Design an enzyme around this catalytic site. Structure first.
Site, mmCIF file in Angstrom:
data_model
loop_
_atom_site.group_PDB
_atom_site.id
_atom_site.type_symbol
_atom_site.label_atom_id
_atom_site.label_comp_id
_atom_site.label_asym_id
_atom_site.label_seq_id
_atom_site.Cartn_x
_atom_site.Cartn_y
_atom_site.Cartn_z
ATOM 1 N N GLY A 211 0.815 -1.211 0.000
ATOM 2 C CA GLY A 211 0.000 0.000 0.000
ATOM 3 C C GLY A 211 0.847 1.258 0.000
ATOM 4 O O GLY A 211 1.961 1.266 0.525
ATOM 5 N N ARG A 212 0.318 2.322 -0.596
ATOM 6 C CA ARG A 212 1.035 3.593 -0.683
ATOM 7 C C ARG A 212 0.151 4.754 -0.245
ATOM 8 O O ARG A 212 -0.961 4.934 -0.750
ATOM 9 C CB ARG A 212 1.554 3.843 -2.106
ATOM 10 C CG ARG A 212 2.575 2.828 -2.596
ATOM 11 C CD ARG A 212 3.282 3.299 -3.858
ATOM 12 N NE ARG A 212 4.101 2.233 -4.430
ATOM 13 C CZ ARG A 212 5.374 2.005 -4.117
ATOM 14 N NH1 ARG A 212 6.000 2.773 -3.231
ATOM 15 N NH2 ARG A 212 6.024 1.000 -4.692
ATOM 16 N N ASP B 202 -9.220 4.661 7.084
ATOM 17 C CA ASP B 202 -8.704 6.004 6.795
ATOM 18 C C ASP B 202 -9.019 7.046 7.867
ATOM 19 O O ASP B 202 -9.472 8.144 7.569
ATOM 20 C CB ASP B 202 -9.177 6.482 5.412
ATOM 21 C CG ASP B 202 -8.656 7.859 5.064
ATOM 22 O OD1 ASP B 202 -7.439 8.079 5.220
ATOM 23 O OD2 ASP B 202 -9.464 8.730 4.672
ATOM 24 N N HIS C 210 0.473 9.143 1.050
ATOM 25 C CA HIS C 210 1.305 10.349 1.051
ATOM 26 C C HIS C 210 2.252 10.374 2.259
ATOM 27 O O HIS C 210 3.397 10.799 2.140
ATOM 28 C CB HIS C 210 0.423 11.608 1.009
ATOM 29 C CG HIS C 210 1.173 12.867 0.689
ATOM 30 N ND1 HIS C 210 1.339 13.887 1.602
ATOM 31 C CD2 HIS C 210 1.794 13.272 -0.445
ATOM 32 C CE1 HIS C 210 2.036 14.865 1.047
ATOM 33 N NE2 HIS C 210 2.324 14.516 -0.196
ATOM 34 N N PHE C 211 1.772 9.897 3.409
ATOM 35 C CA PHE C 211 2.571 9.861 4.642
ATOM 36 C C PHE C 211 3.507 8.651 4.742
ATOM 37 O O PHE C 211 4.469 8.672 5.515
ATOM 38 C CB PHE C 211 1.679 9.939 5.892
ATOM 39 C CG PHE C 211 0.785 11.160 5.946
ATOM 40 C CD1 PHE C 211 -0.544 11.041 6.351
ATOM 41 C CD2 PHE C 211 1.268 12.423 5.595
ATOM 42 C CE1 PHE C 211 -1.381 12.154 6.406
ATOM 43 C CE2 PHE C 211 0.439 13.547 5.645
ATOM 44 C CZ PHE C 211 -0.888 13.413 6.052
ATOM 45 N N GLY C 212 3.235 7.599 3.972
ATOM 46 C CA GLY C 212 4.137 6.447 3.935
ATOM 47 C C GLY C 212 3.596 5.164 3.328
ATOM 48 O O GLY C 212 2.412 5.064 3.001
ATOM 49 N N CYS C 213 4.490 4.187 3.179
ATOM 50 C CA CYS C 213 4.157 2.867 2.641
ATOM 51 C C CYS C 213 3.623 1.929 3.720
ATOM 52 O O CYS C 213 3.815 2.155 4.919
ATOM 53 C CB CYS C 213 5.387 2.222 1.985
ATOM 54 S SG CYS C 213 6.010 3.066 0.506
ATOM 55 N N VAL C 214 2.955 0.870 3.272
ATOM 56 C CA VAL C 214 2.494 -0.181 4.164
ATOM 57 C C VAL C 214 2.984 -1.550 3.684
ATOM 58 O O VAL C 214 3.141 -1.778 2.480
ATOM 59 C CB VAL C 214 0.944 -0.086 4.473
ATOM 60 C CG1 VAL C 214 0.225 0.896 3.537
ATOM 61 C CG2 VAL C 214 0.249 -1.461 4.536
ATOM 62 N N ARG D 103 -13.158 4.480 -1.515
ATOM 63 C CA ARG D 103 -11.705 4.276 -1.465
ATOM 64 C C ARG D 103 -11.208 4.193 -0.015
ATOM 65 O O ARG D 103 -10.170 3.594 0.255
ATOM 66 C CB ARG D 103 -10.959 5.399 -2.215
ATOM 67 C CG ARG D 103 -11.109 6.772 -1.562
ATOM 68 C CD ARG D 103 -10.256 7.873 -2.173
ATOM 69 N NE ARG D 103 -10.583 9.153 -1.534
ATOM 70 C CZ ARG D 103 -11.537 9.981 -1.953
ATOM 71 N NH1 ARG D 103 -12.249 9.683 -3.034
ATOM 72 N NH2 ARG D 103 -11.791 11.104 -1.291
ATOM 73 N N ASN D 104 -11.965 4.785 0.905
ATOM 74 C CA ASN D 104 -11.556 4.864 2.301
ATOM 75 C C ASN D 104 -12.205 3.845 3.244
ATOM 76 O O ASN D 104 -12.069 3.940 4.463
ATOM 77 C CB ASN D 104 -11.678 6.299 2.811
ATOM 78 C CG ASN D 104 -10.589 7.194 2.246
ATOM 79 O OD1 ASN D 104 -9.496 6.724 1.925
ATOM 80 N ND2 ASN D 104 -10.874 8.479 2.127
ATOM 81 N N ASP E 162 -13.323 12.304 5.634
ATOM 82 C CA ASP E 162 -12.911 11.766 4.329
ATOM 83 C C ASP E 162 -13.561 10.414 3.984
ATOM 84 O O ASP E 162 -12.915 9.515 3.433
ATOM 85 C CB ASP E 162 -11.371 11.710 4.223
ATOM 86 C CG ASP E 162 -10.870 11.507 2.793
ATOM 87 O OD1 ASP E 162 -11.656 11.665 1.816
ATOM 88 O OD2 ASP E 162 -9.667 11.179 2.641
HETATM 89 O O1 LIG Z 1 -4.611 1.728 2.393
HETATM 90 C C1 LIG Z 1 -5.710 2.066 2.839
HETATM 91 C C2 LIG Z 1 -5.887 2.272 4.213
HETATM 92 C C3 LIG Z 1 -7.005 2.941 4.671
HETATM 93 N N1 LIG Z 1 -6.879 2.989 5.996
HETATM 94 N N2 LIG Z 1 -5.823 2.422 6.320
HETATM 95 N N3 LIG Z 1 -5.218 1.994 5.326
HETATM 96 C C4 LIG Z 1 -3.931 1.285 5.374
HETATM 97 C C5 LIG Z 1 -4.127 -0.218 5.137
HETATM 98 C C6 LIG Z 1 -4.848 -0.995 6.049
HETATM 99 C C7 LIG Z 1 -5.018 -2.364 5.833
HETATM 100 C C8 LIG Z 1 -4.446 -2.952 4.705
HETATM 101 N N4 LIG Z 1 -4.603 -4.263 4.487
HETATM 102 C C9 LIG Z 1 -4.078 -4.869 3.420
HETATM 103 C C10 LIG Z 1 -3.346 -4.146 2.487
HETATM 104 C C11 LIG Z 1 -3.159 -2.781 2.677
HETATM 105 C C12 LIG Z 1 -3.722 -2.176 3.798
HETATM 106 C C13 LIG Z 1 -3.562 -0.813 4.009
HETATM 107 C C14 LIG Z 1 -7.949 3.379 3.745
HETATM 108 C C15 LIG Z 1 -8.133 2.706 2.537
HETATM 109 N N5 LIG Z 1 -6.808 2.296 1.961
HETATM 110 C C16 LIG Z 1 -6.650 2.134 0.556
HETATM 111 C C17 LIG Z 1 -6.077 0.978 0.033
HETATM 112 C C18 LIG Z 1 -5.914 0.831 -1.344
HETATM 113 C C19 LIG Z 1 -6.334 1.836 -2.220
HETATM 114 C C20 LIG Z 1 -6.910 2.997 -1.703
HETATM 115 C C21 LIG Z 1 -7.068 3.139 -0.322
#
Ligand SMILES: O=C1c2c(nnn2Cc2ccc3ncccc3c2)CCN1c1ccccc1
Length: 286
Positions: free
Chosen positions: A33-34, A162, A36-40, A148-149, A144
């Site tokens: 995941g990406r 989010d 603005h504040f960082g990667c996951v 998407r959120n 927000d």
């Molecule tokens: O990445 C996010 C997100 C949100 N809140 N926390 N996160 C971080 C998050 C949380 C759980 C996850 N589980 C699996 C894979 C990525 C994850 C990212 C909102 C929605 N979101 C996202 C993911 C993909 C595309 C657009 C938004």
């Protein structure tokens, strides 16, 4: 960790939010995941988790405040709200969140692999309404809300995400820079009064929810594609709303219009939305 800096009330709660570095293996090899504040990244806590870094920011601000936000968010517990598993210290702290197998709601409904029925989509909206009902009872404004959120777990349970320490812009395309205040805003999800004042309330969350219902019923179409950024205020004030999607039940469109009432205080509560949508939902089969 500076315990004396915290509100003395919150001191006990710290041990329940802090994850020991030895309890968490984060797999920095692949980004999942990406923001603005960082990667996951994938993480192992044996529980599978999503670990969000924050090192893309220059600074997280006051560490005591960061901890406070974490403590507040951890106490939130509802099946349609994304939980905080904890915070792990290493540079910047790591936000540890549940792994959401089926990603964000918008991509889920856009995905040619899955075939949600109209009932399924209404049910996704109902779960969001329930997540938001809990958040509003906690006096939390999301600011927000959008498809998407929200995210889906392995059992397709929809969770409002989010927010708190998970807050970020995960799809930059849908945020615009304001003129007088350099803020990046999801204008196409925002209520009229929020566009004018940049103040967000539960009732402007209700406006955003109407838009989210429209996303669900269009299987993730972009709202107002032929409108440009801040000219959305002009467009709405012409006396316009998003059109009724082809397979959106009439009563569900009426719910959307209620969510977009020009008077904020006349929009339905999230409790009333849970009620009305549960009724519409019960009328479908399959
Ligand atoms: O990445 C996010 C997100 C949100 N809140 N926390 N996160 C971080 C998050 C949380 C759980 C996850 N589980 C699996 C894979 C990525 C994850 C990212 C909102 C929605 N979101 C996202 C993911 C993909 C595309 C657009 C938004």
């Amino acid at each position: 960790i500076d315990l004396s800096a915290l509100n003395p009330e919150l001191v006990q709660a710290v041990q329940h939010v802090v994850i020991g570095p030895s309890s968490l293996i984060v797999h920095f090899n692949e980004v999942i995941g990406r923001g603005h504040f960082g990667c996951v990244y994938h993480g192992t806590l044996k529980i599978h988790c999503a670990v969000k870094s924050l090192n893309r920011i220059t600074d997280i601000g006051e560490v005591s405040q960061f901890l406070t936000e974490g403590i507040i968010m951890k106490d939130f517990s509802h099946p349609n709200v994304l939980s905080l598993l904890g915070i792990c210290l290493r540079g910047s702290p790591l936000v540890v969140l549940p792994y959401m197998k089926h990603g964000d709601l918008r991509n889920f409904i856009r995905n040619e692999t899955h075939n949600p029925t109209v009932k399924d989509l209404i049910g996704f909206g109902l779960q969001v309404a329930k997540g938001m009902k809990y958040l509003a009872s906690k006096k939390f404004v999301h600011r927000d809300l959008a498809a998407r959120n929200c995210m889906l777990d392995e059992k397709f349970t929809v969770k409002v995400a989010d927010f708190g320490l998970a807050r970020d812009m995960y799809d930059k395309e849908y945020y615009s820079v304001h003129n007088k205040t350099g803020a990046k805003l999801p204008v196409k999800w925002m209520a009229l009064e929020s566009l004018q004042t940049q103040k967000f309330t539960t009732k402007s969350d209700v406006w955003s929810f109407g838009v989210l219902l429209w996303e669900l019923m269009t299987r993730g179409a972009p709202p107002y594609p032929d409108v440009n950024t801040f000219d959305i205020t002009v467009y709405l004030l012409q006396g316009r709303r998003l059109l009724q999607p082809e397979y959106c039940p009439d009563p569900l469109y009426e719910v959307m219009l209620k969510c977009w009432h020009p008077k904020a205080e006349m929009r339905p509560s999230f409790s009333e939305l849970v009620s009305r949508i549960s009724a519409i939902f019960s009328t479908f089969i399959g």
